[PDB]
Amino acid sequence: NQPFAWQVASLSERYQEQFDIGAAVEPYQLEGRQAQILKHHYNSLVAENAMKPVSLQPREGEWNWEGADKIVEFARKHNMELRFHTLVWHSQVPEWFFIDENGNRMVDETDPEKRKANKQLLLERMENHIKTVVERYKDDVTSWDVVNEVIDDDGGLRESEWYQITGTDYIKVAFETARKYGGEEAKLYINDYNTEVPSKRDDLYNLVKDLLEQGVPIDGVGHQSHIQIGWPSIEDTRASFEKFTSLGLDNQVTELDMSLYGWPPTGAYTSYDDIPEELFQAQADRYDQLFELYEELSATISSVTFWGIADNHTWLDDRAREYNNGVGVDAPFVFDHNYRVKPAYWRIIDHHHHHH
């Protein structure tokens, strides 16, 4: 039976001078064993939910800073980098953004003069959101996820309310506004998932190149990295990192977890004790290879952030229950649901270098 995460060598120290090791957190996890785990193993942090647009400005001019501030205060106290998730997103965004001064839905507007008015009103609202946030946190944040999931899985830009109302300008303006209030040393990222899929990678590459050629201040690309034990391939991961490095962009892994399952995640285990040890071994093998890659590419990667700390709190539990009639569990980390280390931990902390 394995030792507890507080009883073993630090992950962040293992990867000193290669990349920071981060976790996504909620304010209420900043106590007890999870706080202990954070200090011991991570040197970087991101708010799982406290800094998303809906959390911070749920109605116009009503600002909810308290939870965000707590994460910032803990990062200050314990010398952790802080990434900001997220300034602009089609999801988890208040609907008040997309309603005009008459109470009408901007997406439904038909007359051109009013569509242009709506685009300017929406960009002003977006710019004000970003200005207030960045002015408040600019000295505490070291990477900004400026826009999140702007590329569609079937080829284009995502046809969200932002896109339908502003076209591509909400992206140009979010970056220019972040740069303006954040200063030159703010690092501005575009974040997305399935960046390893050739066709999505290319669409992001095209967007970003095009934005860079227009002088839009993009410093890096964020790779959410919601992966599985058998997908995506190391080769495809490698190709993705290198394509963006070729534009002179930093890469960060922003939301790493490795599901035990495929897609859709049926049929999930309903108990942690039901998970076979061969599956955990496979997870360890894959993490080893993944972190060997990261290391191969560490000049191109500034930060690797897991989307949580230990298996007892993961959005992947929700997603298992969503696809399995409300029951089901996932175990995507190197620390288990009781905070004990898993086979994956030993395989990413180790100094093995014999290749495979």
In 3D, which of 272, 224, 313 has the Cα closest to residue 34? 313
Q: Which two tokens stand for residue 148?
A: 């999140």
Binding to Ca ion (CB under 5 A): which residues in 280-299?
288, 298
* Of positions 81, 109, 145, 219, contacts Ca ion by CB under 5 A: 81
Distance, in Å, from the CA atom of 220 to the CA atom of 95, rounded to the nearest integer, reads 29
Closest distance to Cu ion from the beta carbon of 240 (Å): 21
Closest distance to Ca ion from the beta carbon of 300 (Å): 7
Evaluated on CA atoms 323, 335, 309, 90, the torsion sign reads: negative
Considering CB distances under 5 to 8 angstroms, the limit depending on partner class, which of Ca ion, Cu ion, none binds residue 311?
Ca ion
**Which entry of 95, 255, 277, 295 is annotated as an active-site residue?**
255
Q: Residue 3: is it exposed, middle or buried by C-beta count within 10 angstroms (0-12/13-18/19+)?
A: exposed
Distance, in Å, from the CA atom of 45 to the CA atom of 332, rounded to the nearest integer, reads 18
Q: Which stretch binds Cu ion (CB under 5 A): 28-36, 41-49, 226-234, 286-294?
A: 286-294
**Residue 164 touching Ca ion (CB under 5 A):** no
- C-alpha distances in angstroms, 36 versus 32, 101, 233, 333? 6, 48, 34, 17
Q: Is 255 tagged catalytic?
A: yes
Helix (H, G, I), strand (E, B) or coil at 327: coil
**In the stretch 336-355, what mask flags binding to Cu ion with x, by CB under 5 A?**
--------------------
Distance, in Å, from the CA atom of 211 to the CA atom of 136, rounded to the nearest integer, reads 27
**Residue 288 touching Cu ion (CB under 5 A):** yes
Closest distance to Cu ion from the beta carbon of 347 (Å): 7
- C-alpha distances in angstroms, 35 versus 29, 251, 254? 6, 27, 20
- 152 or 292: CB nearest Cu ion: 292
Closest distance to Cu ion from the beta carbon of 202 (Å): 30
**Residue 350 touching Ca ion (CB under 5 A):** yes
- 113 or 351: CB nearest Cu ion: 351
Over its C-alpha atoms, the chain yields an Rg (Å, rounded) of 20
Largest CA distance in the chain: 68
**Residue 290 touching Cu ion (CB under 5 A):** no
**Residue 192 touching Cu ion (CB under 5 A):** no
Q: Which stretch binds Ca ion (CB under 5 A): 3-11, 16-24, 61-69, 124-132?
A: 16-24
**Residue 20 touching Ca ion (CB under 5 A):** yes
Helix axes 66-78, 32-41, angle to 10 degrees: 50
Residues labelled catalytic:
255
Summarize as ranges the residues that interact with Cu ion (CB under 5 A).
288
Summarize as ranges the residues that interact with Ca ion (CB under 5 A).
19-20, 81, 288, 298, 301, 311, 314, 317, 329, 347, 350, 352
| Residue numbers belonging to the annotated binding site for Mg(2+) | 18, 288, 292, 298, 301, 347, 350
